[PDB]
Design a binder for this molecule. Structure first.
Ligand SMILES: Cc1cc2nc3c(=O)[nH]c(=O)nc-3n(C[C@H](O)[C@H](O)[C@H](O)COP(=O)(O)OP(=O)(O)OC[C@H]3O[C@@H](n4cnc5c(N)ncnc54)[C@H](O)[C@@H]3O)c2cc1C
Length: 449
């Protein structure tokens, strides 16, 4: 219990009814600080707690691979919350209008949401505060250290965020207390109608066969815990020296569960720190789930233009601009990149892996984004192409981790200058020849036709 995890958004008259919790980024019952604080505030106010989720109108911007994954977990979440006397209300529409009408017609006392630094989340918040008179608070239930408490500014490098975050670990890395219980439309409805609207835009093969394969990642809080415990007892020892070999999938595979909030990163760290494994293989894992993951929330929180050329460091903007008029080797289009029609079979295999599984390997995701810059008309055209492709097919898309990693590959955010070659400038270059020495490229290409 720490009061630094909750920040007030608007102060008003405390109502006389139930505490409404606005679930957005953390779709789980266990290990949800925003859910725990909702009950704690409800208990001291002699009022029940209720959880609300808003299905936004932006779902038609992505495929069904993300729609079915999150909705299937919501079906498990509704039953898991019913076992704790907490009613889950699933609304469909704009949050600025659905939540404003829900608070008034339900007599809410205190309305709480979870933290998300993305622009669209701030878009809803601005409209919510314009239609409520009750207190409005938000809780960071996605980061071990609150994003505003870790650093009060945009950190420039990973080696500068590591001392600040690791110093605040003993105050914020704590066990999760139990969520004690209190004292309309079925989800199968919207899942059927939603899929029907996304079917014409589903990615297919030549024989009218859908490209997505949904047997790689089962959604749900239950399946998320099995993936964590399996990775620790079978892959944690080999994560250090095999995280960059996509031929062996020696990764946690938590990104679909982590992005949708189906599992807490603080719970994952607790189980890893209390697991006797290789010393080097462990330190490399927390470096990604603590430093690199929570620096992405830091990137989107303190940079309003996180998806634009303006958020690049000064040295990268000067480097890339001096190479805007350099002759590009090739200029593929959005339709070419989407179906993997480039002359680089390592890039095609990376794009084919994303279409068929919905989760590209960590190493190949850097090579995939940097070649987009090398084959684009302008750096700004690469940002849009990389964002549209990542957010449409990645199960972990539409996440601060994506915009930060896209800014890392194209603009060198949280990176330094390198050799100065044409087009890419001083940005870190990843050659096909350098990839042949790191791992078996012939194995990765043959794994995806
Ligand atoms: C251009 C680009 C786009 C990306 N798009 C996304 C995205 O939209 N959403 C997303 O969650 N990840 C994205 N990744 C970040 C990273 O690739 C993924 O976190 C990782 O691939 C997820 O698969 P994993 O859980 O099996 O990896 P693991 O090796 O198991 O990492 C464990 C966790 O640490 C975090 N993590 C790992 N690597 C990074 C990293 N480089 N930066 C920040 N956090 C990290 C992830 O949360 C990850 O779940 C992107 C990376 C790049 C370079």
């Amino acid at each position: 219990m720490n009061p630094k995890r909750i920040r007030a958004l608007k102060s008003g008259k405390q109502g006389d009814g139930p505490v409404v919790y606005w679930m957005s980024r953390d779709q789980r019952a266990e290990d949800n600080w925003a859910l725990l604080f909702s009950r704690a505030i409800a208990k001291e106010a002699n009022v029940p707690v209720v959880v609300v989720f808003c299905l936004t109108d932006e779902f038609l911007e992505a495929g069904i691979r993300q729609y079915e994954f999150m909705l299937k977990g919501l079906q498990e979440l509704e039953v898991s919350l019913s076992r704790k006397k907490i009613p889950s209300f699933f609304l469909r529409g704009d949050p600025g209008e659905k939540i404003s009408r829900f608070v008034k017609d339900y007599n809410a006392g205190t309305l709480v949401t979870d933290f998300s630094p993305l622009r669209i989340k701030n878009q809803w918040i601005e409209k919510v505060i314009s239609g409520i008179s009750i207190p409005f608070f938000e809780v960071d239930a996605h980061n071990v250290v609150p994003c505003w408490e870790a650093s009060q500014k945009h950190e420039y490098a990973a080696h500068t965020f590591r001392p600040k975050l690791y110093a605040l670990l003993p105050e914020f890395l704590e066990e999760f207390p139990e969520l004690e219980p209190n004292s309309v439309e079925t989800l199968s409805d919207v899942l059927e109608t939603g899929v029907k609207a996304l079917l014409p835009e589903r990615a297919l093969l030549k024989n009218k066969d859908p490209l997505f394969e949904p047997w790689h990642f089962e959604p749900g809080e239950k399946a998320a815990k099995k993936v964590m415990e399996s990775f620790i007892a079978d892959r944690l020892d080999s994560y250090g020296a095999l995280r960059n070999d996509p031929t062996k999938n020696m990764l946690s595979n938590l990104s679909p569960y982590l992005h949708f909030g189906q599992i807490s990163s603080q719970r994952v760290v607790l189980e890893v720190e209390k697991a006797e494994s290789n010393p080097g293989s462990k330190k490399a894992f927390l470096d990604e789930i603590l430093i690199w993951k929570e620096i992405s929330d830091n990137f989107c929180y303190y940079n309003p233009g996180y998806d634009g050329f303006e958020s690049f460091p000064s040295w990268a903007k000067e480097s890339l601009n001096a190479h805007r008029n350099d002759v590009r080797s090739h200029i593929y289009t959005l339709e070419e990149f989407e179906a993997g029609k480039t002359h680089d079979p390592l890039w095609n295999a990376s794009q084919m892996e994303l279409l068929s599984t919905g989760k590209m390997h960590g190493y190949t995701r850097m090579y995939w984004a940097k070649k987009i810059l090398e084959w684009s008309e302008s750096p700004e055209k690469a940002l849009e192409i990389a964002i549209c492709l990542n957010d449409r097919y990645e199960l972990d898309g539409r996440d601060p981790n994506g915009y930060a990693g896209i800014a890392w590959s194209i603009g060198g955010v949280h990176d330094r200058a390198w050799g100065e070659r044409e087009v890419t400038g001083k940005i870190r270059y990843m050659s096909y020849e350098g990839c042949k020495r790191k791992f078996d490229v012939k194995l990765y290409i043959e794994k995806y036709s």
